[PDB]
């Protein structure tokens, strides 16, 4: 009826007003600082090992990387905006962490839309699907124990004073792993690491993705 | 002609400036997107990586109240063509691609006076597919799901007009002949999330010509 | 040299009155349809892949159309009869290969020539991969392949196509190509498709070629 | 002084770019000088008759709209600026088989007399039959460079020499250069009543 | 926490509203290479592919600020598009550089900037002898494309390439890697030209 039509128009005007009040009325987040540090939660869902190149020692993964963080500057009261509890927005509208593979051999290829979900408590969920080429000797992939390769993910420019990383579990999600991949996964772990490098006194944080796989 | 041109420029200005823009679907304002595939070619089947490359055009249809107009107010313009950047479009994504989709057609949609939008992107898609059996009579079978990347069934529903893939543009001298191609709406509940997720499952059975 | 400053001022004034002081052309309509003339100049068959049935062409595609909204009196603009402009400053037709297997690679600058009668000429050079079975390319008869070109989104009621000639221009064809051209035609076609109710117009590029020996 | 030098350059660029060019015309034609420095023949593909060159292409022209009095801007005689800030000529290979790959920053040098020097490094794949490359006499291939959209009436081309600069050619290339010339040509095509100008790059090379 | 954000936002605003170096306002760029991998060596085309991160440091008076005026903020991370960056270019690449890291730099209160682009580079290299004891040697020069030694000086902190992150299971082992400032007076141009010459000696793992 007209009431239902009015409620939909109101829901749209409420969303437009909330996104306006966060992005127009408030200047985009400048990123974390030693005084305002930020924990990014990382999680990997490994979908496929596409290729293992023994001629270059490069391996190609397809996965989706779940990133979660929380900003005060993104909080709102659902009761002020028609009980809007969350919204979808272009990743370009918000700050996103510079989470980078430390040993890629090619630019990451993005396989999913650059859109995130923002929740009223100011939490952000961003799940980019990627194809990655990284440094990996596949020697042993034709063996019972298979090959093992590792790649570290972390901020490229922020130390542990500004950006901390967390995992919810050290088990890579394999529940979406392609059943007819050329490679079967023997194990996949994601482990937070704290490193002190010689360059700099600040500790650095990464999540180490370790994959054990063999030819099916 | 100059009147017709003025009427279309007025219509586009009314819809894109003078009306507030649509912010995407919500739980309170859900959207149904109709998907259909027209399969043009299986270009390549890589048994070294279990990747298959398809070329198709994907018809996407949806309807917004904010894109409606009365043709009698605009010299009986009943539709127009517009850049996809001008309007909201659904984030329809292959779930098991191995490479970024390559777009083969212009980013232009058709808007009709009832507020319905038709967008027909042609794509080259690399996806996870074991072609084992392609050189046999039974051929190989591969599947890829398509759906919203970021919207659940509470904001975007999917439908097909038919579960038969359109094979009317399938390349007659392809390396691969199609034994069957179906497109089937599926509802799934993942462990992560309590709300339902919707996809369309493209299932292709094919063999060497 | 003073005149040169006036000539530049005139062209800048012309461009400004055409682009800055008007809303960009919204494209053709059923009431105001547009005829685009196409011609292909085939430069090279670079590659014929028998493993995927894809062939790679290099050509430049001449596009010509005419808009009243681009007309000017040369007398009001220091007798300027035409100008070069970025393809981003003007509407251009969405002429698309029907059966490409990869995005077209653009080999020439995105610049067109606008003439005082409102006529535009745009000549994009392209490398195109398209669906083609090269079986018989190593035979006397050679191989035959075809690819249609037309608006992706506009039917025959909004965009009509014509050619000046049904013969592809082979005058620039690379003499030391791996493939020699037996024939190349470009032919207007009016067709109805399963996707859409109204007729669409294309130019069918048909190429018969064989290994150079 | 240094603070004043920055202020002067910023004001000059502001005056040249923000205060004040639509490209050349019949009434205001432009001469572009081209020179090639051939760095490497990377690859010769006898399956497709494509050859890949790496070179830098020196482009020079002079605009009245870019000249200034150095005395009026702290004796600044030249400056570097992004190529996007200025008009640049649409010099195009006539017979490329792939889009040119740009290897150098899109930055030009502008001088107080309004002269501009832009030196893009490029990897180019072009139409070339390398038959004979494995012989003493080697292979010969040629590629024309010129404006895509401007006839000889708007853009004239010049070379300083017909000799391609080989002083930077890669000494351990798979291919040695026997000769490399760059020749201005005036061409009439059946399409067009205006003459068109190109520089014909001709390279004779063999397997080392 | 809200005060720290406010202060950082204010600083960025004040700083961001540089035309590059000049003879009168010259710049020094410090370069250091951290070689991660020789991915492949192509003897059919004499191209080699390196993966490394290139540390770039320079200092501008215009980027200096007093920390006490901005709540003890000693530095900030910013998009490379917000600031001037030097046009450091490989002189003998055969393909455009592929950028493997985010275009973000660190700006410090003294006006210093550190930018560390990770890159994959294809460059001119004959790998002949890579399968011998002596290995193969290749070199590539890095410098400003458009600025002379009058506007941009280049230097290295050390002539030893950092090999401490070199991939242990690379197809190629490094026998030595050096990064050496060179001054060259070309014929065309009376002013000195500065590059850093990256020289890598490598051989197949046995
Ligand atoms: C846009 O579309 C609208 C709606 O289709 C259209 O309005 C319609 O115009 C037609 C023609 O003027 C109208 O048709 C008339 O209907 C009346 C009954 O109401 C008839 O009696 C008329 O018949 C006489 O006139 C005919 C010629 O006009 C003769 O051939 C005939 O023998 C009779 O003498 C006639 O059929 C119609 O009523 C309207 N409809 C509405 C809803 O108003 C409009 O013209 C179109 N164009 C534009 C720019 O808007
Ligand atoms: C995160 C990062 N950023 C820039 C340089 C490279 C790297 C990553 C590889 C190890 C060193 C490093 O530096 C500091 C800590 O980690
Ligand atoms: C559509 C989507 N978006 C983000 C995570 C991955 C994925 C797609 C693969 C299966 C799970 C999934 O999650 C919820 C619905 O489907
Ligand atoms: C040009 C075009 N536009 C949109 C869908 C696909 C296509 C091209 C392939 C055949 C059908 C078609 O539809 C109508 C005309 O031709
Ligand atoms: C320079 C140029 N521009 C547009 C198409 C191709 C070409 C060059 C090959 C011959 C025809 C041509 O067209 C006009 C005159 O020259
Ligand atoms: C840095 C540079 N810029 C433009 C042309 C090429 C190059 C680099 C290769 C050697 C010569 C050179 O020219 C002058 C000094 O250095
Ligand atoms: C253009 O040419 C015509 C005829 O040759 C002449 O009358 C006129 O003065 C010229 N200039 C202008 C500004 O119209
Ligand atoms: Cl944000
Ligand atoms: Cl919309
Ligand atoms: Cl236009
Ligand atoms: Cl200019
Ligand atoms: Cl700066």
Residue numbers in the entry:
A (entry chain C): -8 to 207
B (entry chain B): -1 to 207
C (entry chain A): -4 to 208
D (entry chain E): -2 to 17, 20 to 207
E (entry chain D): -1 to 15, 20 to 208
The authors write:
The soluble ACh-binding proteins (AChBP) from mollusks form homopentameric assemblies of subunits homologous to the N-terminal, extracellular ligand binding domain (LBD) of the nAChR. The binding pocket of AChBP possesses all of the functional residues identified in the nAChR LBD, and its extension toward various directions of the interface provides multiple means for selective accommodation of the nicotinic ligands. The ligand binding pocket encompasses a nest of five electron-rich aromatic side chains provided by residues Tyr93, Trp147, Tyr188 and Tyr195 on the principal (+) face of the subunit interface and residue Tyr55 on the complementary (−) face. This pocket is partially sheltered from the solvent by loop C, which is found at the outer perimeter of the pentamer and harbors at its tip a disulfide bridge linking the vicinal Cys190 and Cys191 residues, linked into a Cys-trans-Cys disulfide bridge (aka oxidized cysteinyl-cysteinyl ring), a signature determinant for nAChR α subunits.
